[PDB]
């Protein structure tokens, strides 16, 4: 069971770092963008043409990096606990023939051992934990709502705000009424961040409430 996770924490800091090593090993420039500098870091984007050029600032590889630091630092943590859990108020055979595969990592752990928490808002009144499970769905939203930021890309947003800032100006009981900052859609690096700095809490606020919400009950 341990001769795998232990090779899959090893496929993490490696992949994570081919991208950081790379990220770094030319914030300077390269063939596609040769003179990539005087600003190096976060210049996210470039024009279309050449081959088609994108998240090729050493920041956006950092940007890209932080997903595997959020996937190692999960395989690893994930692992302890399942182990510990089982190695407490009960067995260990459990992690033994049931971590040598994959489905099961989802079924018993993930699916076994959440029990306690979720039937904790229960149709039958607020029982033991409530902070936690609401956190845990607060966990699943903050996450998901990363995606916009992430599959949206300033173009589509700005443009309907072009139509949506023809409202006010053209509607009574809301005219003259001036903004002092001109309605726009988020910068073309900014939203790679915000989806992230969003992807992250969701994610890190879900295990936060996941483990607790189940190492506490137990059984272990």
């Amino acid at each position: 069971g341990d001769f795998l996770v232990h090779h899959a924490i090893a496929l993490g800091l490696h992949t994570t770092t081919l991208i950081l090593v790379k990220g770094a090993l030319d914030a300077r420039g390269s063939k596609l963008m040769p003179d990539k500098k005087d600003f190096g870091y976060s210049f996210p984007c470039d024009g279309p043409g050449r081959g088609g050029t994108c998240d090729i600032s050493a920041w956006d590889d950092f940007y890209l990096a932080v997903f595997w630091m959020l996937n190692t630092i999960g395989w690893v943590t994930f692992y302890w606990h399942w182990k510990h859990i089982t190695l407490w108020r009960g067995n260990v055979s459990q992690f033994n023939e049931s971590s040598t595969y994959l489905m099961g990592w989802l079924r018993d752990y993930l699916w076994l051992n959440s029990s306690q928490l979720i039937n904790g808002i229960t149709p039958l009144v607020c029982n033991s934990l409530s902070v936690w499970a609401w956190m845990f769905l607060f966990g699943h939203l903050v996450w998901a709502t990363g995606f916009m930021f992430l599959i949206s890309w300033r173009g589509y947003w700005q443009e309907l705000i072009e139509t949506l800032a023809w409202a006010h100006e053209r509607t009574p009981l809301a005219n003259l009424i001036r903004w002092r900052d001109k309605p726009v859609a988020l910068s073309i690096v900014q939203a790679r961040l915000v989806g992230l700095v969003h992807f992250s809490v969701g994610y890190i606020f879900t295990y936060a409430a996941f483990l607790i919400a189940s190492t506490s009950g137990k059984f272990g």
């Binding site: 023809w166 053209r170 009574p172 009981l173 003259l176 001036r178 002092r180």
Partner: protein, 161 residues
Amino acid sequence: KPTYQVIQPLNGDPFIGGLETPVTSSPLIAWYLSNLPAYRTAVNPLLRGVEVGLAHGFLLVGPFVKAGPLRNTEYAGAAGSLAAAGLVVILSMCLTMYGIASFKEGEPSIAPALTLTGRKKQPDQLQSADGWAKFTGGFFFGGVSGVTWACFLMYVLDLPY
């Protein structure tokens, strides 16, 4: 007389939008809205303040006295004021620090009338800070107050059915 006014997109030139249809500029509506701050600034903002404060006032009651947080109240301080004599207050300076996006600092007094106005370039601003005060000051005494002949009115109520 025509097909629909002397047929026009806007007041005139069709390169501004507005696409003056009805729901925009039918004498049927555009008159239901100009004793108030639609086309022309009557008296100053001073008075309009409280018909605005008050009308919008005795609203927000059954909204937060019939949809209140634990609802249908048996507390003699609800079916009215209760708290919401908070909204008008959380927003009677939601305004004042928007009239800080207005400064322009004067004192003319021209709510009395002279020569059939226009206020001319009346569009854009041309209402300084010492205006937007006497309105959002009309607002507080329109908000708080307009909350009590709501409250004060007993409640003779029509019901479901």
